[PDB]
Amino acid sequence: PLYSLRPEHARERLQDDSVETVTSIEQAKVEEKIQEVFSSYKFNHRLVLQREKHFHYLKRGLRQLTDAYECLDASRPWLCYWILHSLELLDEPIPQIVATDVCQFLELCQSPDGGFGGGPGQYPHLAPTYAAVNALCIIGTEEAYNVINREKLLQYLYSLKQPDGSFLMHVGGEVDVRSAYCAASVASLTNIITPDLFEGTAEWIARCQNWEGGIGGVPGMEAHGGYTFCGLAALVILKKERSLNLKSLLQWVTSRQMRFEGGFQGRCNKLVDGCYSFWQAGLLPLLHRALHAQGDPALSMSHWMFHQQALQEYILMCCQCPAGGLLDKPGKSRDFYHTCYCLSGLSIAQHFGSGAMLHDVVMGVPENVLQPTHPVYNIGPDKVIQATTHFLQKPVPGFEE
């Protein structure tokens, strides 16, 4: 069978120790609901990524949205990135006219101060800056690469940089690890990193790793998948992963995979959610690469250090919306963010590779395989390469001389 449908899998249900708190009441609500979903497959005998439905959802969204979306009016490059990336994983080619329209759009989101904002004329902010540059890389054309003003981008990053190594998310803004990842992602792809740009940053990100092993959004905070993804990936870019305690970080992620549901939770004693199929499980490839670089002899050579099969089972059986798009969990409504990260999650859980090993695990029909994603940038590895190449043809500003 499938792992989740086997009868011993029932012994993986929550044990509340006869002591009920809100935490267990909520976990049981979810597990009971996921058990239904599992039983629904097991009435008649068969695992299928509804690609065609997902595509319709995406293709339409990329062009036009109802006023249901007024609240993403400040996050529009996120919508480009989430949708483009989802199309990219689904191996859907993006028409020249769509691509060009996105370039032109992201161009109007670009601030004269450098960086990008949530929409035309909005102030720049690290998150849409990150999303827009990723969207531009997925497109991968010379038109797209050239939208980016690199010199203003650097100035813009300089303006956010803090004495203690952190970054503001925007001018007059907040700090957490996200800004560090966004800055590194963007700076590295565009070849604008200077001697002193990320100075202090590694040590800052490191102070965010806490007693649980994971990283919190700022020093002292609870460890969380999203912030932990951001920290580690930011260190990997900067090549200072070893600042962190990786053995504890490993023990923490691996623990975030849910024994019953199959998917991951964002932090300990909270609920499973499909987006963490990327933010949590994407840590495994990053750690594999880091431990390999330190000489580790015991690393698997076929698998990441999570239940790949169980994660794919969770995504496919619980996180697809039959009308298209993907979910956090059943009962929840689709959105492009979860569509993006479930799929990025799925691709990671299918595609192992290390050094020269390659080993795939494709649950369900083999047309389920996605394209691979780069676990640092979460765009395709081809796209990373092409973009880092192109921007290496240019000097870091300045110089030059």
Partner: protein
């Protein structure tokens, strides 16, 4: 003054007080992507917000306008920035602004822009008097709200407000002993006040965590806390611990206990104990029990742990 839900709401374009000013439409260009078909109230407020912004008009009317623009999209950090600039220029009363943000956060507590605003207000007022009880009421609706804990920790660090936090922490543990945000808080608080080296502290802490583990064996947070406060001391300087956990086993097993036993054995082996081969076999046995039987979701983790133990505790 004029509410968006008022029956007599009138569009800005139809208001005589704004006759002097031209709306500025959004330029999405000639074939937009991700184009939001804004409702008419929305486009109208934002057409006028743009116009006010563009000319940097520091008017009381622009200030009321921002309120609307935020009601329609509380996530527009451009609007919030402009509002902060106006708060300053019109030299506004920050106590009412504090009440404004209080109500807003209560309505949308999972929104970065709104906690950050509140925080900027507290820096301006350098006055944390309202913060902990405010935060406590949000936490009372969502005990794990991450923004609320972040803000809590920030107040406490800046205005050195440590003196009651362990009391609040103990209470929340009583309410939901599984609330990881609260174990993180306990740790946050203790490492900043006393530290964990004072033996008396460490003992109260270890005893407490064990009382809690016995009460609820499958609560990972307790186990994570136990490992966290101890692992760095070295587990093997505490010889009673091994035995005290073996005692629980029959009556209070859980993969967490089994995992901890492995952590101890690993500390033992690092520290050149007697029966090296015997300890190593107990550990590899347990790893196999985890991978195959009691924690199969982590089968790949546990097999890598067994292979690490063999690799380095050998000949």
């Amino acid at each position: 003054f004029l509410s968006l839900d008022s029956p007599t709401y009138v569009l800005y374009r139809d208001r005589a007080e704004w006759a002097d000013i031209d709306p500025v439409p959004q330029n999405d260009g000639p074939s937009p992507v991700v184009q939001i078909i804004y409702s008419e109230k929305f486009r109208d407020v934002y057409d006028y917000f743009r116009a006010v912004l563009q000319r940097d008009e520091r008017s009381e009317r622009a200030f009321k306008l921002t309120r609307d623009a935020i009601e329609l999209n509380a996530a527009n950090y451009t609007v919030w920035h402009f509002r902060r600039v106006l708060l300053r220029s019109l030299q506004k009363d920050l106590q009412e602004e504090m009440n404004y943000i209080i109500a807003i956060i209560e309505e949308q507590p999972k929104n970065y822009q709104v906690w950050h605003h509140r925080r900027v207000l507290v820096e301006w007022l350098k006055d944390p008097s309202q913060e902990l009880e405010f935060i406590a009421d949000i936490l009372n609706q969502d005990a794990k709200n991450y923004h609320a804990w972040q803000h809590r920790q920030w107040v406490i660090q800046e205005f050195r407000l440590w003196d009651n936090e362990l009391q609040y922490v103990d209470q929340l543990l009583k309410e939901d002993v599984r609330n990881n945000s609260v174990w993180n808080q306990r740790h946050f608080v203790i490492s900043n006040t006393t530290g964990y080296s004072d033996r008396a502290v460490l003992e109260r802490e270890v005893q407490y965590t064990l009382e809690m583990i016995k009460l609820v064996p499958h609560n990972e947070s307790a186990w994570n806390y136990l490992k966290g406060i101890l692992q760095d001391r070295g587990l093997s300087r505490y010889p009673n611990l091994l035995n005290q956990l073996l005692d629980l086993q029959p009556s209070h097993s859980s993969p967490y206990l089994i995992a901890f036993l492995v952590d101890i054995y690993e500390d033992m082996l690092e520290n050149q104990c007697d029966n090296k081969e015997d300890i190593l076999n107990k550990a590899l046995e347990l790893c196999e029990i985890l991978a195959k039987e009691k924690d199969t979701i982590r089968k790949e983790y546990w097999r890598y742990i067994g292979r690490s133990l063999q690799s380095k505790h050998s000949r």
